[model samples]
Target: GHQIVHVRGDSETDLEALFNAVMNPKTANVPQTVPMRLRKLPDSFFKPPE
Candidate 1:
């Protein structure tokens, strides 16, 4: 079985609120932007130097 997770109404506003909630208050004064890009990294990115 699988379940779906989604955001309801005004993603831009909700996302901004979510970001601000976890952000450092001291640095929270920066301008806000929407629809940011998310990138996936290769496994090597997390591998320890050997």
Candidate 2:
């Protein structure tokens, strides 16, 4: 058996709050950044001269 649940007005406001709660920059391309070279080589460089 399946039970049906009813959505009150709270659900609508909650969803709306969540939608605008975070950054949703819908921009395209925008030229991504290459980040800074704080560490040499990189953390992912496991083996050194294999």
Candidate 3:
């Protein structure tokens, strides 16, 4: 259950954009990248033989 109030002009526009930004953000297609590395597994392996 919910209630609604009608707004006018700038207020309506502002509210609409606010909801849209959270629900559906319109991003400026910017590209970016990052680098990462993984560490080698320790030979301890409980010293289990192959």
Going through the candidates in the order shown, the clash numbers are 0, 0, 0
1-50: candidate 1 lDDT, tens digit per residue: 89988977887886786687557645566455552233466666667688
| Predicted structure 3: lDDT | 0.56
Per-residue lDDT of 11 in model 3:
89
lDDT of 1 at 10: 87
Residues 2-48 of candidate 2: C-alpha lDDT, one tens digit per residue: 99998786887657555654445242323344445544666656555
- At residue 23, candidate 3 shows an lDDT of 64
| lDDT tens per residue, model 3, 1-50 | 78898867698667676676656565422233342223355656446676
Using lDDT as the measure, name the better of candidate 1 and candidate 2. Answer: 1
Candidate 1 stretches with Cα past 4 Å from truth are 1-8, 24-50
The candidates, ranked best first by TM-score, are 2, 3, 1
**Full-model lDDT for every candidate:** 0.64, 0.55, 0.56
**After superposition, candidate 3 runs with Cα above 4 Å error:** 1-9, 27-50
Better of 1 and 2 by TM-score: 2
**What is the Cα-based lDDT of residue 32 in candidate 1?**
52
